[PDB]
Amino acid sequence: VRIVTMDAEMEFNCEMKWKGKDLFDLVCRTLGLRETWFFGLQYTIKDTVAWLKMDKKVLDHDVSKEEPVTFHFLAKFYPENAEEELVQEITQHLFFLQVKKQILDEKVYCPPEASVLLASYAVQAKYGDYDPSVHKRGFLAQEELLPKRVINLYQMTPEMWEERITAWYAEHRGRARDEAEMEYLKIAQDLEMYGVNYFTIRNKKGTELLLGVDALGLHIYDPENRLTPKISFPWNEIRNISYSDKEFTIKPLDKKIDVFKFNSSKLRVNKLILQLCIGNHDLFMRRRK
Template sequence: MPEKRMSVKVRSVESELEFAIPLNATGKDLFDKVLQTNGIREIWYFGLEYTDKYNNTAWLDEKKKIKDLDIKKEDVLDFRFRFKFFPENVVDEVIQDSTLRLLYGQIKKDILTELLYCPPEKGVLLASYAAQVKYGDYDEEYSRSGYLSNDNILPKRIINGHKLSRQEWEEKISLFHQKHTGMSKEETMLEYLKVAQDLETYGISYFEVKNSGKKTDILFGIDALGVNMYPKDNQLNPTVSYAWSEIRKVDYKKTKFIVKFKGGKEQLNVLTTKPKQSKRMYDLATGNYSMYMRRREPDTLEVQQMKSQREDEMARKAKEKAILNKEIAARMESERQRKEFEARLKDMEERMKVRDDELDNANSKISEMERQLNEIREAKESIEKHESELEEMIREMQIAKNLEKEEWERMEEEVRLKQEEIQRIQMLVEVKEEESKALQEEVQEARTRMEEETARLQEEVMLARARMEENEALLQASMNGDAQSERTSSGKTSRRTSYTISREDLEDMGPEIIDPVEEREVTMEADMMESLEALEETLAQTRDEEAENPMDQFHRENVQQGRDKYKTLREVRLGNTKRRIDKFESM
């Protein structure tokens, strides 16, 4: 008889899986199956979340059978594969790319759905990192088409709280996107998480509780750095906080969650308000405490091996990136030279056009010169005609010597006028001949200049093409050489010796654990911080105060007072244990 099974669905930010598991399967059976399917090795961060029959969020107990859970009974049981415990510092702790992707996806989703508070200016910065992850380097041509128009770019709270259009938000995100050129997906996700982990509500699980004195409604937060107590309406600024290094033990009894401290008998009594809440708070607190202590102990052999593999992978990626950057630089140089060549070619074409115009002008002058030569020829013919007529008139005068005096004077006057006409035409011919000679010299000079300029332009084109061909040949040779070098190096086996901390090292480690908050600061590169401050000032001018969220008001007050996540925690962790317990009870 076939074994009876039940259907479960497990969703993560990357996938949705469905399994048919035996009715007697435990939480560990399902969790292991999910880990195996997703290829996750850093298992200590993750858990399976579900919604119980009271509509509260709960975490799967690996020891219990699935059928015994107080989960909502449906045909297909619904679970969410999520980070249950968060790293203190992403850079130092996250080892595998698969873990990095899941953490990035979950934090990004929590910010966009407003489970995790993010101020407007950092929302724009994080959106620009998300654009780099999705689209790669900013492309001006592609970006003109509104490449972010279909993306969920910012929390609705940020958009509704400012008088800016969708296009204006996209333009601000694009300006920051341009600053991330050359960053790989993994590098960009890490930068995203470096910013996100400094947000006040990062990695905190909040519970609605009451203090045992005034029975005031309070938010109790548990995270990687300790436990915090907040006013009910303010998740950003805790009133009281304790580091894990101060806590000796946590416990629970039905509707009470108990925190016991080192060096004394004082304890913090927290009253819970929902079914099984104290047990769930206990599970999260003990898990975070164990993670806190584990970070301060020598790495296990498994973690050492994973870190060694990560170093090898990072070295390989760094080498690949160096080769890629070299190729990109060479391509960019080749593109620059191509554009320079095209610009010079365009300039030469314009200069050739000028030469063509000059040639047209010269041809016009030649036509004019030919017209003038025709006029000179006609003038010479006219002179010859007039000279012939003059000779004929002289002959007639010689014949008519015996004519009357008046007739003789008339003929003399005609001869004089004819001579003056001949002289005028001769002077005109001389002027035309001088103009023709000057025009011939000008045309000859223009032809000589055009021939010299054409020859020089042709020589420039040939040299530019030769340089481009030479650069392309060098680029190809360089790429082939790098590829050969990469093949050669990849053929070698990398060997590493696992590092084990010795007993002497352990003895050197003092028993006292320093609260990491003491030395923690919100850090960012100076130029990025400057750009972010400028954006914050710009957004302040577009703020819609009527639509503003109270969390934004709390954040703005913190900024005005010069406080951030770690400064606030340092401040509220001042004072001895008893004083802070009294402060909690008086909330």
């Protein structure tokens, strides 16, 4: 099999009767990764993300049998406080890279000023301390430091943008690569779209809405706004989630608030939702134990 991480690529000889937990543990041991609960192995079926089941046969999955057979090692779940919950430099680094990619690809909205500060920590992490003798005008010119949306919002040239980033970069002197990547994560985790799984749903009337699923609970959004939910259901505020046919129903732990019901058509998606729900709830509770 071919295992693709954010920064690296592995090749593995897999035994035909091995299970997800075997291949996962193999990748985890190879990386030196002891906090395994955040991660998973991803392939996508028909435009939909899917994850490798631990207790099921590897080749039983819908993954393309055509060689090489390819899975992406990625964080499935996100901590509530990155600095507090990510102990190993390896786990931190994995999150840093994946999150930074989400932000650059505009999977996670970041506003312009924050995006410049984020870019500056990424530069600190890669190049170490700012050195005007080492780093002169044009030194970032081939890097992609900013979302295109931020760049397009202004008339600024690459050197104008380099100047804004370098101005911030200069002030980070003294922070080690891991500390810089963690400062990046502290900012990114406060972004509103950070760590949220979005799914198109519809309510009883048939109004198209968005279901978010994250570490803190469940959220309903107007399709146009992914930043602020119209409704939130914190994990410790919900009695049960129910699924049958194409429908979900959310029953609040307080009987005096209406249950929320919605329709989700695609079946593969619905499993993902339940998976994500169970996973996120589990992690929510264990932080509070």
